Structure formats: C-alpha cells, structure tokens
Amino acid sequence: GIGDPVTCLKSGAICHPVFCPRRYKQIGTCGLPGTKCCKKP
C-alpha cells in the first residue's frame, strides 16, 4: 500500500530520483526504476 511505484501516484506523490526536496517525504517510486516518490508526510 501507500509507498510503491504505482500506488505512489494513487497518493499523488511526486516523482524524484535519488531523493526528494521540500518537507515532503514518502519513500516510494515512479516506475520500474528505483525512483524516489515523495508525498505529504
């Protein structure tokens, strides 16, 4: 659940590799890549 490559979008999480700026956080992905999805912490 919340915290995946797909569901990541389900939470409107942003797509950012390496890390994610801003007071945001999630620890998700984007797609097949180990992208770093960020969402409202």
mmCIF file of N, CA and C in Angstrom:
data_model
loop_
_atom_site.group_PDB
_atom_site.id
_atom_site.type_symbol
_atom_site.label_atom_id
_atom_site.label_comp_id
_atom_site.label_asym_id
_atom_site.label_seq_id
_atom_site.Cartn_x
_atom_site.Cartn_y
_atom_site.Cartn_z
ATOM 1 N N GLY A 1 0.822 -1.197 0.000
ATOM 2 C CA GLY A 1 0.000 0.000 0.000
ATOM 3 C C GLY A 1 0.867 1.262 0.000
ATOM 4 N N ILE A 2 0.203 2.397 0.158
ATOM 5 C CA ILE A 2 0.898 3.674 0.178
ATOM 6 C C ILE A 2 2.399 3.429 0.334
ATOM 7 N N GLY A 3 3.137 3.791 -0.706
ATOM 8 C CA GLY A 3 4.579 3.617 -0.698
ATOM 9 C C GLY A 3 5.013 2.588 -1.742
ATOM 10 N N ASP A 4 4.689 2.886 -2.991
ATOM 11 C CA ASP A 4 5.038 1.999 -4.088
ATOM 12 C C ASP A 4 5.254 2.826 -5.358
ATOM 13 N N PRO A 5 5.522 2.100 -6.477
ATOM 14 C CA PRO A 5 5.748 2.753 -7.756
ATOM 15 C C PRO A 5 4.435 3.257 -8.354
ATOM 16 N N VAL A 6 3.416 2.415 -8.259
ATOM 17 C CA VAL A 6 2.106 2.762 -8.785
ATOM 18 C C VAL A 6 1.334 3.560 -7.733
ATOM 19 N N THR A 7 0.897 2.851 -6.702
ATOM 20 C CA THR A 7 0.149 3.479 -5.626
ATOM 21 C C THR A 7 0.713 4.868 -5.323
ATOM 22 N N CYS A 8 2.006 5.014 -5.571
ATOM 23 C CA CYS A 8 2.678 6.280 -5.330
ATOM 24 C C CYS A 8 1.846 7.393 -5.970
ATOM 25 N N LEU A 9 1.407 7.133 -7.192
ATOM 26 C CA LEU A 9 0.604 8.101 -7.921
ATOM 27 C C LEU A 9 -0.792 8.170 -7.299
ATOM 28 N N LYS A 10 -1.214 7.044 -6.743
ATOM 29 C CA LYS A 10 -2.522 6.963 -6.114
ATOM 30 C C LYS A 10 -2.592 7.968 -4.962
ATOM 31 N N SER A 11 -1.418 8.349 -4.480
ATOM 32 C CA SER A 11 -1.331 9.300 -3.384
ATOM 33 C C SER A 11 -0.901 10.669 -3.912
ATOM 34 N N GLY A 12 -0.798 10.754 -5.231
ATOM 35 C CA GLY A 12 -0.398 11.995 -5.872
ATOM 36 C C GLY A 12 1.056 12.340 -5.541
ATOM 37 N N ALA A 13 1.776 11.332 -5.071
ATOM 38 C CA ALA A 13 3.173 11.513 -4.714
ATOM 39 C C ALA A 13 3.953 11.988 -5.943
ATOM 40 N N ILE A 14 4.981 12.781 -5.683
ATOM 41 C CA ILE A 14 5.810 13.306 -6.754
ATOM 42 C C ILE A 14 6.835 12.248 -7.166
ATOM 43 N N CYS A 15 7.431 12.468 -8.330
ATOM 44 C CA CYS A 15 8.426 11.546 -8.847
ATOM 45 C C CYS A 15 9.775 12.267 -8.886
ATOM 46 N N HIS A 16 10.689 11.791 -8.052
ATOM 47 C CA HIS A 16 12.015 12.379 -7.982
ATOM 48 C C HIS A 16 13.038 11.297 -7.628
ATOM 49 N N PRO A 17 14.068 11.169 -8.507
ATOM 50 C CA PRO A 17 15.113 10.182 -8.298
ATOM 51 C C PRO A 17 16.069 10.623 -7.187
ATOM 52 N N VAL A 18 16.866 9.671 -6.723
ATOM 53 C CA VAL A 18 17.825 9.946 -5.667
ATOM 54 C C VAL A 18 17.074 10.259 -4.371
ATOM 55 N N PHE A 19 16.536 11.468 -4.313
ATOM 56 C CA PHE A 19 15.794 11.902 -3.141
ATOM 57 C C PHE A 19 14.618 12.797 -3.537
ATOM 58 N N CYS A 20 14.123 13.537 -2.556
ATOM 59 C CA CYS A 20 13.005 14.435 -2.788
ATOM 60 C C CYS A 20 13.163 15.647 -1.867
ATOM 61 N N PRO A 21 13.224 16.847 -2.503
ATOM 62 C CA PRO A 21 13.374 18.083 -1.754
ATOM 63 C C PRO A 21 12.062 18.473 -1.071
ATOM 64 N N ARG A 22 12.131 19.544 -0.294
ATOM 65 C CA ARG A 22 10.961 20.030 0.418
ATOM 66 C C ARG A 22 10.706 19.180 1.663
ATOM 67 N N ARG A 23 9.817 19.678 2.510
ATOM 68 C CA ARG A 23 9.476 18.977 3.736
ATOM 69 C C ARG A 23 8.656 17.724 3.421
ATOM 70 N N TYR A 24 8.644 17.370 2.144
ATOM 71 C CA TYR A 24 7.906 16.200 1.700
ATOM 72 C C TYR A 24 8.699 14.918 1.966
ATOM 73 N N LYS A 25 7.990 13.799 1.905
ATOM 74 C CA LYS A 25 8.612 12.507 2.136
ATOM 75 C C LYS A 25 7.601 11.398 1.837
ATOM 76 N N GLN A 26 8.133 10.229 1.512
ATOM 77 C CA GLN A 26 7.292 9.085 1.201
ATOM 78 C C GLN A 26 8.133 7.809 1.142
ATOM 79 N N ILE A 27 9.110 7.823 0.247
ATOM 80 C CA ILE A 27 9.989 6.678 0.080
ATOM 81 C C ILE A 27 9.352 5.689 -0.900
ATOM 82 N N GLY A 28 8.776 6.243 -1.957
ATOM 83 C CA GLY A 28 8.131 5.425 -2.970
ATOM 84 C C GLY A 28 8.980 5.357 -4.241
ATOM 85 N N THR A 29 8.302 5.122 -5.356
ATOM 86 C CA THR A 29 8.979 5.030 -6.638
ATOM 87 C C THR A 29 8.170 5.747 -7.720
ATOM 88 N N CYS A 30 8.594 5.550 -8.959
ATOM 89 C CA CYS A 30 7.920 6.169 -10.088
ATOM 90 C C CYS A 30 7.419 5.060 -11.016
ATOM 91 N N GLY A 31 8.353 4.223 -11.444
ATOM 92 C CA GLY A 31 8.022 3.121 -12.331
ATOM 93 C C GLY A 31 8.895 1.900 -12.039
ATOM 94 N N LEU A 32 9.528 1.400 -13.090
ATOM 95 C CA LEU A 32 10.393 0.239 -12.962
ATOM 96 C C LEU A 32 11.690 0.651 -12.264
ATOM 97 N N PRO A 33 12.043 1.954 -12.428
ATOM 98 C CA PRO A 33 13.252 2.484 -11.822
ATOM 99 C C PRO A 33 13.067 2.689 -10.318
ATOM 100 N N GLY A 34 14.183 2.640 -9.604
ATOM 101 C CA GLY A 34 14.156 2.818 -8.162
ATOM 102 C C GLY A 34 13.942 4.287 -7.795
ATOM 103 N N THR A 35 13.114 4.948 -8.591
ATOM 104 C CA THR A 35 12.815 6.352 -8.362
ATOM 105 C C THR A 35 12.421 6.582 -6.901
ATOM 106 N N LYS A 36 12.493 7.841 -6.494
ATOM 107 C CA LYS A 36 12.148 8.206 -5.130
ATOM 108 C C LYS A 36 10.875 9.054 -5.140
ATOM 109 N N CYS A 37 9.775 8.419 -4.764
ATOM 110 C CA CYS A 37 8.493 9.100 -4.727
ATOM 111 C C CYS A 37 8.376 9.831 -3.387
ATOM 112 N N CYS A 38 7.884 11.058 -3.459
ATOM 113 C CA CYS A 38 7.717 11.869 -2.265
ATOM 114 C C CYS A 38 6.240 12.251 -2.146
ATOM 115 N N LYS A 39 5.749 12.214 -0.917
ATOM 116 C CA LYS A 39 4.360 12.552 -0.655
ATOM 117 C C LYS A 39 4.271 13.357 0.643
ATOM 118 N N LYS A 40 3.058 13.790 0.951
ATOM 119 C CA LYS A 40 2.825 14.569 2.156
ATOM 120 C C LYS A 40 3.067 13.687 3.382
ATOM 121 N N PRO A 41 4.143 14.036 4.138
ATOM 122 C CA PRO A 41 4.493 13.286 5.333
ATOM 123 C C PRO A 41 3.537 13.610 6.483
#
